[PDB]
Each structure stands twice: as structure tokens, then as C-alpha cells.
Amino acid sequence: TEQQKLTFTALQQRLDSLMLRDRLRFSRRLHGVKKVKNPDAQQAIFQEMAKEIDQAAGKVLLREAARPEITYPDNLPVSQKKQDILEAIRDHQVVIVAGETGSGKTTQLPKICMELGRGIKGLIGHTQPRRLAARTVANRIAEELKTEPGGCIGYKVRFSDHVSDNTMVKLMTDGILLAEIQQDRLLMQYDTIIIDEAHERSLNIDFLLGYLKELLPRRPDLKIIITSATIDPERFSRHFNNAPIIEVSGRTYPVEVRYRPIRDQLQAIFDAVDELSQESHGDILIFMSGEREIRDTADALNKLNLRHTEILPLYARLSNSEQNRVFQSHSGRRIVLATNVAETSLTVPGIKYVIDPGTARISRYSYRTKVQRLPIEPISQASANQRKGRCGRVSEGICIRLYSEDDFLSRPEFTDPEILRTNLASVILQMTALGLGDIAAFPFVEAPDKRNIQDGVRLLEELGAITTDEQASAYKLTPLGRQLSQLPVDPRLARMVLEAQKHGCVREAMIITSALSIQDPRERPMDKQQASDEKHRRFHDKESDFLAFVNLWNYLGEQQKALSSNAFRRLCRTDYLNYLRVREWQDIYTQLRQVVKELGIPVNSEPAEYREIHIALLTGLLSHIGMKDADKQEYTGARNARFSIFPGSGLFKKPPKWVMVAELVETSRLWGRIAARIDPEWVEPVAQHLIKRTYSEPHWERAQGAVMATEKVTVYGLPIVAARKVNYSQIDPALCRELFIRHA
């Protein structure tokens, strides 16, 4: 058939005028047409696809009609650099925009992409580190185009998919784009990708910067731009060949630095507040490192009882009502004692002066202890400059730094990226799901330490997720290692949900894991701490912190359905429960039930017993078991580490011998936050890949006619069985004969 191939070649040539998503499926579908024998059938299937191609070809033409007017406000400094960047984007595959806080590049960058003509044949993805950053930026570009969000400009987050068929700009969290990679590895949905706030150097951000480097050869038609602050924009250019950089000014008033080093710590803060009161009676933002540190400074400043003041705290876990109190109205004098939330996420309003002690809690993975550590460290130069920048908003400000300039200049320029200091267990799991087994070959922007990667590989083996196909360093995951990839939860938690089906507890396991994936919805406010406890202690199980979630879950589900929507938000307030988190605890549970149902795992309708729910949970907590010390309230855990039970635990008063905790974190000691009693008999059937068997005192016993010994099974060093006499002859007959021969 040569005329049939003319209708074939002419059709593909037309197919270049379609959306990239459509252009792929039709091109494959045509390549399977000549496979059919009958040419009479072919002429019937070209005619149909051309009818479907015609709809798709018209789809883009209709789409171009919905392109709106392009408007750039003259307030923003980026509107001046607009002509410089626009030329750079069309001419270069990769462009990098870095600007100060005032620039307004974030809102106007999607507009320049549209002015270039992108967004019609394929979507333009814009990625933000937090949800609200994705949501507010979308709502802002809609405002500036006299359209409403979800239309031309849309945003997708974990539970809101506000996108339409005429959408051209897609705001989203960086993790959303990652979830889309398994389904669409070539990212054919998008015509251009803009990555914003890349200076934060998140684990997702760093992984995206690698994956995009890998597909650029297979996606020449797409162009990509990465955006950040003026902090190390040359790393990004080096990553993508030598990509062009464009810098934009910011609208901020000048800030002055005053280095004043050195209860000696608390006294230094007093002198700083006294100095600021002389020069002006303005707001002071004092960065604080912890709830205990914010509580000690708050009691100190309120103890002085300054006449015209208000001591107002702000931290991440604070009540959404009490947190949003800072964003109301300035009256009298306000000094806000805040933590990192005021450095990146929140941006506290009405600030004139900022006091920087230069200390912050940073999360680190100790590949010695294999435990998450939260030390209080000196912050980086960039972190101090970010704190310094949170004070110049509307009027001229000054920033006082409570340390010497030589200390500041001695500090690293930038904080360590997250990929370098967290466990890569889930990271490598998702990589193996995509076929990216060789982690050394993956083009990281900052490659992690080799020993750090292997810790993740070991944890996956601990969960049964990974194996190698007798290769050197390219892994292939197991059938449940792929199911662990399908659940959007921590690998430890995903593993217990899978093991949950062998026992009658999939509902309970989904409740537990969902709760452990959020900040604790139960709130313990700074005032009425004991009052909060009596309200929270209604559901405490005598020996299981995990079961407390189940009781609380059934309670809230029953009260949500029994009374109104407004009366429920009140019941959340009167029981010290964050409504939004209680809501999200349900949304994760609902998402789990989807994939759990989609994988065919049956979910129970009956309540389960204590042993089955917790045996299922133990599957993800094998490194998190401990044995109590005799006549001591301390625990010996995995390896030779020692941890104490968290004080807010239902079994803190009466700690059993054998425990499992959900989380081990080291601050001053090693704390096991969510804990429950376990029987050591349970640990052996699940740790077959981990147990180490040692045999001792071998002797020949006449009655049974075999050699006997005392065996001690050991997981991560812990004696699950201290000793039990067993016939050594069945265990290793050759060795027993050799001992019998040598008379021993």
C-alpha cells in the first residue's frame, strides 16, 4: 500500500499543529495502523483519526482565542528587565532569574511566558515550595488579568485541583510535579517549566533540578527557567551547561547591621531591646529557636513589665487563630518572639527592627546513630541576611546581630541543602520506581555522601522494598517495594499499611499512618496546659499511643456528622484541636483508602485487636524497638543507642520492658515520641531478614540423643530471646558431628 501511506504521511505532517499530549497518542496510534492487514480497514481508521485529529487541531485554535491581554504593573522593577529576559527565554532553553524581595518576578514570569506564546500547545508549570505560595501566586496573577482563579490561571495542590481546559499557567507545589512524573515521565503536559524559590534547596527542589537536567535531551521543544533569590545563582547556571542569568532589583528600604556580641544569652537580648527603644518606638522581631526558648524569653520580657508593650509569640504549631492574631492591627508596641516561620514562610507585617541571636534548630541525619538529630546551631550568612531582610518592609530599618562580625564572616555562606542531611530512603525508592537505579549516575546539583545513600538502601531492605539484579549499584524494587511507592506516605508507614492486610486492621492502620503524617492535631497551648491535657487524655489507651488516634478519630468522625459545620469548628476549639489538621488527617486517610482499594487490599469493617494493629505497625518500626533497663526508666534501642520515653506519652508513667516508638529524635536526650507496649515474641516472625543467631554452651544430652546449646537471637543488638535450649544437631548437623569428633 503506497497510497495508504500518503494519507498516513500527510496526516502526521498535519499533527504538528496539536497539543503535545495529543501529538504523542496519535503518533503512536498511527504507527500501529499499518500492522493491520486489510487496506480497506486502514482507509476506515485514517478517516476516523483525521476526524479526531480535526477536533484536536481545532482544540488548540479555540484555545488561542482565550489568550488574555498582557499587563505589567509599572510598580515592579521586573517590568523594566522584561524586554531583556523575553529575548533570553526564546533564544535559550534554560534561563535563570534571581531577584531581591521586592522584584515581583514571581507574578510576572508566567505573563512573559504567555506573551512569548507558551501555554497554548502545552501548559506552563509554576512550582512553589508551600501550598499557600502556589495558591496566593495563582490568585494574584488572576487578579492582575481581570480573570478569576481556576480559569486561565490555575493552581493544583494535594487536595485542590483548580485547573480548567482553558488553563495556561499551572501553579503547584514542587511535590505535585514530582507525583506527575510517574504517570508522565516526559512531562508532555507542559510547554515550559518555571521552578521558583529554588534557593531554598529543598529535597524536592534538588531532585527536580536533576530530573529536568536528564530529560532536556528527550524534550527539546520545552524550555525551562529556574528562579530564586540572589543567593548562589551560579550553581544553577553551572548545572544546565552555562545557562544565562538575569538579576532584578528589589523594593526594600535600606537596612543597617549592628554587631553586638554578648542568662548571658537572655541579658544580651535585654540590652538590644533597650537600645532600640531609644532610637524609635517601633516593633521588634526577635528570632527564637524553640518553644522552650520562646517561653523563657517571653516570661523574662513580661517580667520586666514595660509600660507600652505587648509580648506576642509566633511559632509554627501555634493555634491558627492565635497565629493570625499577629496579622490584625498594630496597637501600642509589639515585640514578636518568633522562629523560622518568620524567616521564610510567614513574613510578619509591620516590622521596624529585628534582633538576630543567630541560632536555629536544624534537622540532621546521624549516619552513626541512624537517628534524626535536631541540634541548635549558628545560622548561615544567608540565613542571617534573610532574617535581616524581614525588617526593611515599609520604612527604613536597622538589624542588630547578637554576635561578632568575625563570627558572621566565619560562618558558611549558605545552609546545607536538605539532600545532604536527611535520609534518602524515600528518595531512592521513588528513583527506582522511575527506573533510575544508578544513584551515582543521576545528575544531582549537590551529590549526597555515598555512605548516606547506602543508609537509605539498608532501610529499604529493612522494609523489603529493594533488591539488586546481581549488579554493582543499580537496584530493582520488589513487588511490595512498588506498592510502597504507590502510597503517598512515609516508607515506614507505607510498610505497616501493607502488612496491615495480613491481619484484620487496614482501617486502623490507615488511621494511624495518616495521623503520623501530619503535625499532631491535638493542641497544647502555652496557657491552660493542664486543662488541655484533661481534654486530650479522654482517649489515652493504657498502653498504646497509636490507639489514641483511633479513639480520637472515631470521636471526631462521629461529632463531624452529628452537628453542624460551624458547631464542629467550635467543638475543635473547645477541645484544643486544630480544625484544619483534623480535616487533613481525614484527607490523607481518604487518599490512602483510594490506593489501598485500587491495589485490592480489603479494608475491615470490624474493630481489630491490640496485637494485630500493633504487629502491623511493628513492621515499619523494627529499628525503633527498645528494652527497658531493670530498675531504670531508660530504654536500650537499636544499635547501642539509649532513648527515653517522651513525657507527653500515655505510657511514660509505667514504661514496659519492650516498646516500639514511631519516631526517634535527639535533642538533649533520645526521645521516642509515639510509643506502645509490645511483646518481644512478635519481633521474631517479622525480622527474619534481620535476626542474628548465636549459639552457646554446646553439650551432648543423652535422653534426646543429640547435641544441645543455648541460642540468643539478636535484632540490631537486642536480645529478643535471651536463651532457649534447642537441639543443635538439627540446626547444623555437620558442625555437631565435627564437635562430637573433636570431643567438645
Closest CB 591 distance from RNA, rounded Å = 7
Count, residues near RNA per rule CB under 7 A: 64
Of positions 339, 359, 578, 636, contacts RNA by CB under 7 A: 339
Distance from C-alpha of 721 to C-alpha of 139, rounded to nearest angstrom: 61
Residues 14/55, Cβ–Cβ less than 8 Å: no
> For RNA, which is the closer residue by CB, 486 or 560?
486
**Least distance from C-beta 267 to RNA, angstroms?**
22
Instruction: State the DSSP string of 11-23.
Output: HHHHTTSS-HHHH
Reduce the secondary structure of 103-151 to three states and give it as a string: CCHHHHHHHHHHHCCCCCCCEEEEEECCHHHHHHHHHHHHHCCCCCCCC
In the bound complex, what is the minimum distance in angstroms from residue 688's beta carbon to RNA?
28
> Using CB under 7 A, which residues numbered 448 to 507 contact RNA?
485-490
For position 414 contacting RNA by CB under 7 A, the verdict is no
Which residues does a gap of C–N over 2.5 Å follow in the chain?
Answer: 262
The Cα–Cα gap between 404 and 667 comes to 26
Q: Which of 361, 573, 583, 628 binds RNA (CB under 7 A)?
A: 361
Contact flag: residue 655 with RNA (CB under 7 A): yes
CB atoms within 10 A of CB 685: 10
Q: Does 648 help bind RNA (rule: CB under 7 A)?
A: yes
By CB under 7 A, the residues from 683 to 722 that bind RNA are none
C-alpha cell at 189: 503536559
Closer CB to RNA, residue 496 or residue 608? 496
Interface of this chain with RNA, residues 264 to 323, rule: CB under 7 A: 289-292, 315-317
Among 21, 140, 476, 524, contact with RNA (rule: CB under 7 A)? 524
For the chain, the helix, strand and coil percentages under 3-state DSSP, each to the nearest 5: 40, 20, 40
Q: Is 251 in the site for RNA (CB under 7 A)?
A: no
Residue 529 binding RNA, by CB under 7 A: yes
Q: Which is nearer to RNA, 147 or 344 (CB)?
A: 344
Q: Given candidates 130, 476, 535, 583, which one binds RNA under the rule CB under 7 A?
A: 130
Distance CA 688, CA 679 (A): 17
Q: Which of 60, 86, 306, 374 binds RNA (CB under 7 A)?
A: 374
Within residues 625-644, the interface with RNA by CB under 7 A covers: 633, 644
Binding window for RNA (CB under 7 A); candidates: 191-199, 265-273, 356-364, 469-477? 356-364
Q: Which stretch binds RNA (CB under 7 A): 28-36, 174-182, 500-508, 689-697?
A: 174-182
CA 413 distance to own-chain centroid: 25
Instruction: Give the phi and the psi of residue 689 in degrees, each rounded to 5.
Output: -75, -5
Among 158, 260, 333, 593, binds RNA (CB under 7 A): 158
Q: Closest approach of Cβ 295 to RNA, in Å?
A: 9
Which of 7/486 has CB closer to RNA?
A: 486
- Site residues for RNA, window 27-86 (CB under 7 A)? none
Helix (H) / strand (E) containing 98: strand 94-99
Given 360, 424, 466, 550, the residue binding RNA (CB under 7 A) = 360
Q: What is the DSSP string of 180-210?
A: HHHH-TT-TTEEEEEE-SGGG--HHHHHHHH
707 and 671 Cβ atoms separated by less than 8 Å: no
Pairing of strands 364-366, 353-356: unpaired
At 639 the three-state DSSP class reads: coil
Question: In whole angstroms, how close is the CB of 156 to RNA at the nearest point?
Answer: 7
Helix (H) or strand (E) holding 37: none
| Window contacting RNA (CB under 7 A); options: 253-261, 333-341, 391-399, 444-452 | 333-341
Alpha carbon 353 to chain centroid distance?
Answer: 32
Which residues bind to RNA, rule: CB under 7 A?
129-132, 157-158, 173-176, 178-179, 182, 202, 204, 289-292, 315-317, 339-341, 344-346, 360-363, 372, 374, 430, 433, 485-490, 517, 519, 524, 529, 591, 595, 633, 644-648, 652-655, 663, 665, 667-668, 671, 673
